[PDB]
Amino acid sequence: SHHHH
Amino acid sequence: NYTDYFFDEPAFDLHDGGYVPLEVSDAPEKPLNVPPLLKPDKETATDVYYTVTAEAGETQLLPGAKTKTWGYNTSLLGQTIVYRRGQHTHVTLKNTLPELTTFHWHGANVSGPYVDGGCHAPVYPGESKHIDFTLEQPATTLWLHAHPCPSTAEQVWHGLAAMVIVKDDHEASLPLPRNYGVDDIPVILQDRRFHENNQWDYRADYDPDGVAGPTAMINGTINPYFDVTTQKVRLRFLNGANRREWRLHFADDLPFTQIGGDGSLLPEPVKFTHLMLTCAERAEVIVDFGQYHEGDEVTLYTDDVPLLKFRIHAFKPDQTTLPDKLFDVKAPVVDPALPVRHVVMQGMDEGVAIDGKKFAMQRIDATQPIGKAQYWDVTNSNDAPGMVHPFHVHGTQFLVLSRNGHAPYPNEHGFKDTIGVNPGETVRLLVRFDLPGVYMYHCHIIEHEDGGAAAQIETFDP
Amino acid sequence: NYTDYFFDEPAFDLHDGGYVPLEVSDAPEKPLNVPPLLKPDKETATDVYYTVTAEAGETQLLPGAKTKTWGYNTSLLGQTIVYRRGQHTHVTLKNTLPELTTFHWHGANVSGPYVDGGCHAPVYPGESKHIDFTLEQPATTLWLHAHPCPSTAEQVWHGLAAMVIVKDDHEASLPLPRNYGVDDIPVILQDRRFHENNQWDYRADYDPDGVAGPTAMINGTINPYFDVTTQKVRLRFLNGANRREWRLHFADDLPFTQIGGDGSLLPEPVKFTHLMLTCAERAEVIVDFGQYHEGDEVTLYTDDVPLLKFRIHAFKPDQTTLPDKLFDVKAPVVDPALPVRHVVMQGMDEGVAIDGKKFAMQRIDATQPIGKAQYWDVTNSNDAPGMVHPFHVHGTQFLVLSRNGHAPYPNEHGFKDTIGVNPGETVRLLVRFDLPGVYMYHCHIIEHEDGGAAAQIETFDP
Ligand SMILES: [Cu+2]
Ligand SMILES: [Cu+2]
Ligand SMILES: [Cu+2]
Ligand SMILES: [Cu+2]
Ligand SMILES: [Cu+2]
Ligand SMILES: [Cu+2]
Ligand SMILES: [Cu+2]
Ligand SMILES: [Cu+2]
Ligand SMILES: [Cu+2]
Ligand SMILES: [Cu+2]
Ligand SMILES: [Cu+2]
Ligand SMILES: [Cu+2]
Ligand SMILES: [Cu+2]
Ligand SMILES: [Cu+2]
Ligand SMILES: [Cu+2]
Ligand SMILES: [Cu+2]
Ligand SMILES: [Cu+2]
Ligand SMILES: [Cu+2]
Ligand SMILES: [Cu+2]
Ligand SMILES: [Cu+2]
Ligand SMILES: [Cu+2]
Ligand SMILES: [Cu+2]
Ligand SMILES: [Cu+2]
Ligand SMILES: [Cu+2]
């Protein structure tokens, strides 16, 4: 569920 | 809301105008290359003898043609070299390349400028040199890479880098994974651009602000997986890229514990979910796969891009626990007679400089007496927008005292040889040189080094 | 059964195992490029001001894609730069290349090692330098080329060479063709190998014994012709090749007269049908087309290969005859307190060396007092089979006294800065340095220089 930048 | 990393978010590489995003390769998944340990030519308790040969060959990286590559004792990168504290070490350096090169022991406190193996230690094609030295420094992960001036960036791009592991008695007494290739592995983080026929072309990709390609390469492997056969795994991260910053985390934010930095164990273990490394930085971490089960594949990312898959196999439970203290960092006392040294990194692109000047091989820029610790205030003067400059000093392991007058980052309380300095920031280092001679300090975005953002310091016996 | 050339036939380049024969290109015939005269930014009688900019561009050499090339004040080679004995000369050096470079005034008696523009005079991308000097030497043809160490061979290959003309009162008084581009032209002799898309690729063609391609290139032109509009023509030959020797003759063995060499006019005119030149040698010749009529063509060859076609148009008959003596060679007296210096060139391929050593940038190999002429005995110690090594000394114009105890060649009684030394041969030179500092001597097969066959000499005021 989590994406970076 | 917040970045998950310690560095200043606006300065991240991904804001540069010419930023090259990583792209996932379609190349098939394959086992992570673990470079074999280099077999000594001869070893006793007191003496070890090695031959390190720079060579050209070919490596199957993508399907189709093999990539033309350089390596140490192998076609690409290098066999891992083990040194021991207090052991008299003998190395024959052999160059079988068509170009002159240099053998720089990054982070090794050996004499300069010859043994150190920077600009002033050329080895011509077909020739050999003999060096020897005894390391008196803590156990850590160092590395070897080419350092002709100019031409460092290009030679590293061809593939001339190798991990160096330094052992000591203290580290051997700690409860750490240490079975090399099984639960203790190098993770050499690089990128490349592949052109026609899977070849590299540094000059086509040249950028004075730093070369980066879209394909991640881990220990000279594309789309690597690692078979985990133990509950805990030690990873020796090395940023071996020309410019790129790595922002490392697992897909599901699996925690990991940093136990070592560039120059030593950290005094205490530091828990992380996300860790950023600038060029030449090393970080040693333990990952615990205890919540996973046979058949699971857990992936390490940089940002949104997958890098390295860990295929989980059956493993025996592991109850062991790290001590609260890993290592006693004994800070030297500053010599009170010595002033504060101010070093200023200036400019970007072609205009990069240190203290108003571009490097000159005949010119000494600074002096410092051996055995005497001095405060170095290092400033990245670039206004907004700017970049994080990794500042490296040859011939010392330094300590980090402060960042803009505040605490160092949590993983910066051990010995380091490279530190990322944010735009506008002044960092205070405690720097002592043990051995006399000539040493370089510079930015370790390698194109900046080649572009002349370097100076040299003469250390002397008083 | 006699060769027509002065050098030792067995040692000619064409006997090497990796010899690359020239081949006539299929490219269209076209007018010989005559590089324009570089316009001073400002000139008075006492001072001249110039801007010399190293730049990267593209040149249409073959049909289709343009070749990526480097040049001075142009895409390839350079604009011809005119200096005058006695005139204070100001040059701004500007580097707009992506790599650092050096601005070497080959044969110009200027201070070293900075103005000289050798290994110790880097100019980084984007920076400028200011030099000034006053030439106090005879009129002659010199040249400018890149000289970073290493990387000279590669930068010359990219196209960083330009002709430099030095004027004086004595030469102006002589009845010589001097209308630049009409009856007085550079003939810059080089070779290249074209790859995919008409590009050059030094690294693919690299050979430590000397790089040579099959395609002759004359002033940056493939398959050139020149329209002759005068009875007599002055050709200023420069061997700007990495290795290749030129063995020059016209179709029908049409005579020509050499009037000049590297460093001065010849004392007396010398008549030739066949002239051999090694790397960096220059030779100024007068060709008389008096016997030909409009519509005739005369081809200049090297060996059996056509280089340059001279197309005879209508011409006024000539107002010239050469004096029996062109120039007074004022030979200095050897300082009798000084020993004979012996310099030995050794090895081939990767093993090239001078006096048992490869070059080191911070090492001084020799010393000599300024203002004092010394005998240098220079030996090529290559057994047969060997090669002719062109030996070059920075910062001086020397005199050739003898070859194996015999007379120098007919065209070697003037001042020279480069001399071809045959296998096993000792040449005796008379060498004086006017200016203090640091100078180099080396083989001018450019791969040999980059491979470390060079040493440095420090000159001092006593
Ligand atoms: Cu942002
Ligand atoms: Cu020993
Ligand atoms: Cu030894
Ligand atoms: Cu390094
Ligand atoms: Cu280093
Ligand atoms: Cu290369
Ligand atoms: Cu995350
Ligand atoms: Cu299994
Ligand atoms: Cu300060
Ligand atoms: Cu930037
Ligand atoms: Cu930098
Ligand atoms: Cu360095
Ligand atoms: Cu023959
Ligand atoms: Cu003046
Ligand atoms: Cu000036
Ligand atoms: Cu030259
Ligand atoms: Cu020269
Ligand atoms: Cu090709
Ligand atoms: Cu003939
Ligand atoms: Cu006509
Ligand atoms: Cu040879
Ligand atoms: Cu002798
Ligand atoms: Cu030279
Ligand atoms: Cu040579």
Task: Give me ligand 22 centre to Cα C388, in Å.
Answer: 20
Bridge-based pairing of strands B42-43 and B128-134 is unpaired
Upstream peptide bond of C385 is cis (omega within 30 degrees of 0): yes
Structure tokens at C138: 């005879």
As annotated, the residues of chain B forming the CATH 2.60.40.420 domain(s) are 13-169, 175-312, 341-460
> For residue C154, which phi and psi values (nearest 5 degrees)?
-70, -40
> For residue C52, which phi and psi values (nearest 5 degrees)?
-115, 115
With a CB cutoff of 8 Å and minimum separation 6, the contacts of C295 are C312
Within 13 A of C439's CA, how many CA atoms are on the CB side?
Answer: 28
CATH, range C176-312: 2.60.40.420
Query: Which residue in B has a C-alpha nearest to residue A5's C-alpha?
Result: B303
d(CA C360, CA B111): 19
CB B301 within 8 A of CB B249: yes
Burial of B221: CB neighbours in 10 Å, binned 0-12, 13-18, 19+? buried
Minimal Cβ distance to B124: which of C127, C361, C452: C452
Partner chains of C (3+ C-beta pairs under 8 Å): B
Q: How far apart are the first and last CA of chain A?
A: 13
Q: Using DSSP, state whether A1 is helix, strand or coil.
A: coil
- Residues of B whose CB is below 8 A from C350: 124-127
Fold of C13-170: Immunoglobulin-like (2.60.40)
Nearest to C338 by CA among C218, C412, C257, C433: C433
Name the method of structure determination: X-ray
Task: Give me ligand 18 centre to Cα B197, in Å.
Answer: 12
Q: State the nearest Cα–Cα gap between B167 and chain A, in angstroms.
A: 36
Query: Which residue in A has a C-alpha nearest to residue B2's C-alpha?
Result: A5
In this structure, which CATH number among 2.60.40.420, 2.60.40.10, 3.40.50.2000, 3.90.850.10 belongs to the domain B175-312?
Answer: 2.60.40.420
In the 3-class helix/strand/coil scheme, how is chain B assigned residue by residue? CCCCCCCCHHHCHHHCCCCCCCCCCCCCCEECCCCCECCCCEECCCEEEEEEEEEEEEECCCCCCCEEEEEECCCCEECEEEEECCCEEEEEEEECCCCCECCEEECCCCCECCCCCCCCCCECCCCEEEEEEECCCCCEEEEEECCCCCCHHHHHHHCCEEEEEEECHHHHCCCCCCCECCCEEEEEEEEECCCHHHCCCCCCCCCCCCCCCCEEEECCECCEEEEECCCEEEEEEEECCCCCCEEEEECCCCCEEEEECCCCEEEEEEEECCEEECCCCEEEEEEECCCCCCCCEEEEEECCEEEEEEEECCCCCCCCCCCCCCCCCCCCCECCCCCCEEEEEECCHHHCEECCECCCCCCCCEEEECCCEEEEEEEECCCCCCCCEEEEECCCCEEEEEECCECCCCCCCCCECEEEECCCCEEEEEECCCCCEEEEEEECCHHHHHCCCEEEEEEECC
Task: Give me ligand 5 centre to Cα B108, in Å.
Answer: 8
Q: Which ligand has the minimum distance to the alpha carbon of residue C13? A: 21
Q: Judge: C350–B126 Cβ closer than 8 Å, yes or no.
A: yes
- Residues of B whose CB is below 8 A from A4: 4, 247, 249, 301, 303-304
- Give the largest Cα separation in chain A, rounded: 13
CB C61 within 8 A of CB C188: no
- Residues of B whose CB is below 8 A from A3: 304
* Residue in the structure block whose two tokens are 């201070």: C111
Strand partners, C399: C415, C430
Structure tokens at C167: 């004027």
Structure tokens at C212: 């040579």
Nearest to C238 by CA among C271, C199, C277: C277
With a CB cutoff of 8 Å and minimum separation 6, the contacts of B407 are none
The answer to whether B and C touch (≥3 CB pairs < 8 Å) is: yes
Pairs of CB atoms within 8 A across B/C? 49
User: Which strands form B282-288's sheet, in the order they lie side by side?
Assistant: B215-218, B184-192, B232-239, B282-288, B256-260, B265-272
Neighbours of B367 (CB within 10 A): 9
Task: Give me ligand 5 centre to Cα B53, in Å.
Answer: 19
Minimal Cβ distance to C350: which of B120, B125, B451: B125
Q: Which ligand has the minimum distance to the alpha carbon of residue B405? A: 9
Neighbours of C295 (CB within 10 A): 9
d(CA C55, CA B335): 50
Minimal Cβ distance to C206: which of B98, B120, B452: B98
The type of residue at C115 is V
CB B358 within 8 A of CB B456: no
Task: Give me ligand 4 centre to Cα B281, in Å.
Answer: 9
Partner chains of B (3+ C-beta pairs under 8 Å): A, C
Q: Which residues on chain B place their C-beta less than 8 Å from a C-beta of chain C?
A: 98-100, 120, 122, 124-127, 150-151, 206, 208, 349-351, 358, 360-362, 451-452
Q: State the nearest Cα–Cα gap between C126 and chain B, in angstroms.
A: 6
Strand partners, C357: C354
Neighbours of C404 (CB within 10 A): 10
> For residue C216, which phi and psi values (nearest 5 degrees)?
-70, 145
- Residues of C whose CB is below 8 A from B350: 124-127
Resolution (A): 2.2
User: Which strands form C161-167's sheet, in the order they lie side by side?
Assistant: C81-84, C161-167, C140-145, C104-106
Within 13 A of B397's CA, how many CA atoms are on the CB side?
Answer: 29
Q: Which residues surround ligand 24, an ion (CB under 5 A)?
A: C 389, 443, 445, 448
Q: Which ligand has the minimum distance to the alpha carbon of residue C302? A: 19
Burial of C63: CB neighbours in 10 Å, binned 0-12, 13-18, 19+? exposed
Q: Judge: B301–A4 Cβ closer than 8 Å, yes or no.
A: yes
CATH, range C341-460: 2.60.40.420
As annotated, the residues of chain C forming the CATH 2.60.40.420 domain(s) are 13-170, 176-312, 341-460
Structure tokens at B215: 């394909």
CB B194 within 8 A of CB B215: yes
Query: Which residue in C has a C-alpha nearest to residue B97's C-alpha?
Result: C350
Task: Give me ligand 18 centre to Cα C193, in Å.
Answer: 9
d(CA B38, CA B423): 40
Query: Which residue in A has a C-alpha nearest to residue B274's C-alpha?
Result: A4
Q: Judge: C362–B360 Cβ closer than 8 Å, yes or no.
A: no
Upstream peptide bond of C150 is cis (omega within 30 degrees of 0): yes
Range B192-210 burial, b when 16+ CB lie within 10 A, else e: bbbeeebebebeebeebbb
> For residue C202, which phi and psi values (nearest 5 degrees)?
-55, -40
Whole-angstrom CA distances from B347 to B9, B330, B393 are 20, 36, 19
Q: State the nearest Cα–Cα gap between B247 and chain A, in angstroms.
A: 9
Upstream peptide bond of B150 is cis (omega within 30 degrees of 0): yes
Q: Using DSSP, state whether A2 is helix, strand or coil.
A: coil
The answer to whether A and C touch (≥3 CB pairs < 8 Å) is: no
Neighbours of C424 (CB within 10 A): 15
Query: Which residue in B has a C-alpha nearest to residue C453's C-alpha?
Result: B124
Q: Judge: C350–B124 Cβ closer than 8 Å, yes or no.
A: yes
Q: Judge: B247–A3 Cβ closer than 8 Å, yes or no.
A: no
* Residue in the structure block whose two tokens are 């002349």: B452
Q: Which ligand has the minimum distance to the alpha carbon of residue C11? A: 13
Fold of B13-169: Immunoglobulin-like (2.60.40)
Structure tokens at B322: 């790290």
Partner chains of A (3+ C-beta pairs under 8 Å): B
Nearest to B202 by CA among B243, B262, B169: B243
Neighbours of B113 (CB within 10 A): 20
Structure tokens at C88: 């204070």
- Residues of C whose CB is below 8 A from B98: 206, 208
Structure tokens at C76: 């390839």
Nearest to C152 by CA among C128, C199, C119, C112: C119
Burial of C322: CB neighbours in 10 Å, binned 0-12, 13-18, 19+? middle
